Design a protein around this ligand. Structure first.
Ligand SMILES: Nc1ncnc2c1ncn2[C@@H]1O[C@H](CSCC[C@H](N)C(=O)O)[C@@H](O)[C@H]1O
Ligand SMILES: Nc1ncnc2c1ncn2[C@@H]1O[C@H](CSCC[C@H](N)C(=O)O)[C@@H](O)[C@H]1O
Ligand SMILES: O=Cc1ccc(O)c(O)c1
Ligand SMILES: [Mg+2]
Ligand SMILES: [Mg+2]
Lengths: 236, 234
């Protein structure tokens, strides 16, 4: 027991005009027609602010092709914007493992994924990600390690996902954690006016960011795009 | 000191940027990069220095694409160049171009102490004639994997025409300062230095050009002063 959240309308850029400039100039003209349709129906959804930023989407797509990723895993699908972004970026024989507790969210965006003709690349698993990742390491052979991992699910579990993913991602592969700036609230020891769960995610991200910055197993780079993201490259 | 944008940033608070640098940048910054950054921040043109969080991002992009052969346009004291040389493998080679060697020799002691001076071939010249003669001598086997453009902003579109033939297919061209301190979001911006206003107009034109260029895919990233990654399609 015991719209409720304060971090929906706050962004990390100085100006609403600047963010709208990037979207109107650099994103929307380059957005796939099915990504546009998926984003538009998601914007009407009850959890629409969890939708990944559209400029962050194009950045993830650029990362995937520049590193020639072929096998990826996504944790946190929602309506599937970043998933469809990933699928459109990979080669036609690319494969994605998509994990989410709620497949009903996934089926909101699946028609757009189907019309985009990339559903065949996606293996959706309806479950909590942690048992799926633990079952993977039992069956994970080094020849089939993932090239790329996008983490965008339950925020407080990121550090737990990290311990599994640096063994499920190949050496030199990338793990991308979304929301590592958490609307800017991570820059302060305390932040008043937060919903209890928004406060836990703030504390969890402040701990995760120090963890990733000290983890010798990876090289990192925190990027102030969207709600922030941290790119991790496995060293060993 | 007569420029109106030196104290502007694109993030909403100085505290957020400071948090990123102290949490996720400085503990990962090479000792010679910190030394080069600290002596550059007292130079008279210190606001041209690339942001440290952006440098760590360029290094991540180089390693993820396994770049071997890159070119840098706009060296200054060599923070991005040293960042690039430290990211490339031992046999990596960089072509670094800058009209001013006086700036490069400030960072050269740090580059040598890092042990990566052998990767760098510095050319003191205007970049445009260097690129044009490269088009005359280049063989397809010698194409660059990665290009970082950070020099005179009004010439970015001219550099683009050369670079989409000098970087390999699937290679990356990254343009710095494409958000230009937030000024590009506005058709008119008051009180800018004449050179600052020239770059706002030039960047507003460059951003629409790149976004409509079928030769490349793009991603404009709101890091530092904004950068645009370009991936060559053909
Ligand atoms: N423990 C868990 N395991 C797997 N998924 C979870 C989870 N807890 C929450 N999630 C899911 O993570 C998602 C976060 S929203 C993710 C946004 C999406 N990647 C996009 O591109 O827009 C939600 O759909 C939620 O259902
Ligand atoms: N036409 C031109 N051709 C080549 N270099 C030029 C140029 N016009 C200006 N430059 C150089 O481009 C540099 C831009 S400052 C670049 C910053 C640097 N990349 C860093 O990491 O900090 C200046 O040093 C300037 O000397
Ligand atoms: O659940 C709230 C939420 C808000 C923003 C996000 O980016 C996200 O992944 C989740
Ligand atoms: Mg997210
Ligand atoms: Mg610059």
């Amino acid at each position: 027991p015991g719209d409720d959240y304060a971090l929906i309308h706050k962004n990390i850029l100085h100006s609403e005009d600047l963010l709208k400039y990037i979207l109107e100039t650099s994103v929307y003209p380059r957005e796939h027609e099915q990504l546009k349709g998926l984003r538009e129906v998601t914007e009407k959804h009850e959890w629409s602010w969890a939708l990944v930023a559209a400029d962050e989407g194009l950045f993830l797509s650029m990362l995937l092709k520049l590193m020639n990723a072929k096998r990826t895993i996504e944790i946190g699908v929602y309506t599937g914007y970043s998933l469809l972004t990933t699928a459109l970026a990979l080669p036609e024989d690319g494969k994605i493992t998509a994990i989410d507790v709620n497949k009903s969210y996934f089926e909101i965006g699946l028609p757009f994924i189907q019309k985009a003709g990339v559903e065949h690349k996606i293996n959706f698993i309806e479950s909590e990600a942690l048992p799926v990742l633990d079952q993977m390491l039992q069956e994970m052979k080094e020849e089939d390690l993932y090239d790329f991992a996008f983490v965008d699910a339950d925020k407080p579990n990121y550090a737990n996902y990290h311990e599994r993913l640096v063994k499920l991602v190949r050496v030199g592969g990338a793990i991308v954690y979304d929301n590592t700036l958490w609307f800017g609230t991570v820059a302060f020891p305390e932040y008043p006016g937060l919903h209890p769960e928004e406060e836990e995610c703030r504390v969890s991200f402040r701990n995760l960011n120090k963890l990733l910055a000290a983890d010798p197993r990876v090289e990192i780079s925190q990027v102030s795009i969207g709600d922030g993201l941290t790119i991790c490259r496995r060293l060993y």
